[PDB]
Design a protein around this ligand. Sequence first.
Ligand code: ADP
Ligand code: CA
Ligand code: CA
Ligand code: MG
Lengths: 123, 364
Amino acid sequence: VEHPEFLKAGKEPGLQIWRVEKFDLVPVPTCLYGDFFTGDAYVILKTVQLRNGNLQYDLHYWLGNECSQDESGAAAIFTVQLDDYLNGRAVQHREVQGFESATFLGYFKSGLKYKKGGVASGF
Amino acid sequence: QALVIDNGSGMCKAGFAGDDAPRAVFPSIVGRPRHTGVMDSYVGDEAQSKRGILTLKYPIEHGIVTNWDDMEKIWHHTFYNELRVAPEEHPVLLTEAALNPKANREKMTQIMFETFNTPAMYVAIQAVLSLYASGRTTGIVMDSGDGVSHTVPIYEGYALPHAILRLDLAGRDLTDYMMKILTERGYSFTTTAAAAIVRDIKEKLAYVALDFEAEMQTAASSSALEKSYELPDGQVITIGNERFRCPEALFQPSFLGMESAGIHETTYNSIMKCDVDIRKDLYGNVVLSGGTTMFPGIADRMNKELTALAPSTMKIKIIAPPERKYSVWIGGSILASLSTFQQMWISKEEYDESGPSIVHRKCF
Ligand SMILES: Nc1ncnc2c1ncn2[C@@H]1O[C@H](COP(=O)(O)OP(=O)(O)O)[C@@H](O)[C@H]1O
Ligand SMILES: [Ca+2]
Ligand SMILES: [Ca+2]
Ligand SMILES: [Mg+2]
């Protein structure tokens, strides 16, 4: 993949968050992190700096209660593709609205929030 | 504009990447004139209509291509009659079974580039496509179609080939079995539309019993399970226990004189062939796919059979999307629409230098 965003991903310790918008991976403004449209699906990468020098990767795909089939399907796929891109080194997690793992919830310092709406299906 | 083709044992589903459903669904049947040049080929419903004067072939009756001239006719019909496109203008995604022989994948690739001149093509495993369509990267897919059923465990995006089980019956068998039990009940199906009538009774009236013996009793004791069905000629017949006995053969293949394990058990067995550490995720993401999983009650009864088989604290979730007749097709449409997909295709250029074996390095 030559997708500009794959080139940006997992470069240094941090959290990156993209939204599926119309079969594409679009980055979330860092000021809007933690605010999730429940009509949307997102891909979250958590890069942690390890003692060896290499970075650890956890890839979470978050599914809003109202995201369309194309968005949740694209999030699952983008996840596989980003993992392949990172040499199979990411642990993959399916995060469902209302049932996120504590690890995922832990990424958000002021607590993650839900908001209704989102971008329209790409179908 | 990519195209998506799901070559089903019974039904071919074809359409345009980006659409939420196949634009065309037709039987994978090629018809050739019994007696030649006294008065050429036909595909799909037209071949069925004219079957009295045709020799009909089924080039993929078990998911795998057995005849390449007939498969080529099916693709020509897909392109020109059904989708009405020029194939040389469209990337084409095609689906395959998980254990599709290595020579078949190469042949499919050869045919696309050399016969249809496609600018780009890609081959994808059906079960992985259904998983994606369900918004998952890990899970076990139970796909039951027309002439073939499989259980395909998938971990983080990729099938686990050593754990794939080919379950021995599908839709055709269930139609045959519905016919036989209706005959036994007293009915007679003697027109050329016999198969179709009984297939339709199966599709409209059958259901899967949560507790089969309790259903047999409810049915033997009352009339509250029975349904009327109006035949082509207006004759109305009654469908009793046949409604649930027919799909029960999925759970008890013995009904068909078959020694094989049923669908719940085939599912279990696959999960058991997988690394112990991933099984919990298989059990919590059992995805149903295909026409023959459409029976009402099938999700509950799978939930029940697998609860019985797995340790008692196992979280079992069965996923039976209403659109699962087309899950494979819809996975393909989402895949082929992705911004990141143009890099995935086998291009013509790549084909012209590597030839057909490029498929094993591009598509897995
Ligand atoms: N509502 C339904 N209930 C039971 N069976 C159905 C239903 N709809 C379609 N089928 C059956 O599904 C089978 C075809 O499903 P499909 O997934 O297209 O098969 P394939 O991909 O193997 O060609 C046929 O036997 C058809 O009778
Ligand atoms: Ca949306
Ligand atoms: Ca990984
Ligand atoms: Mg199929």
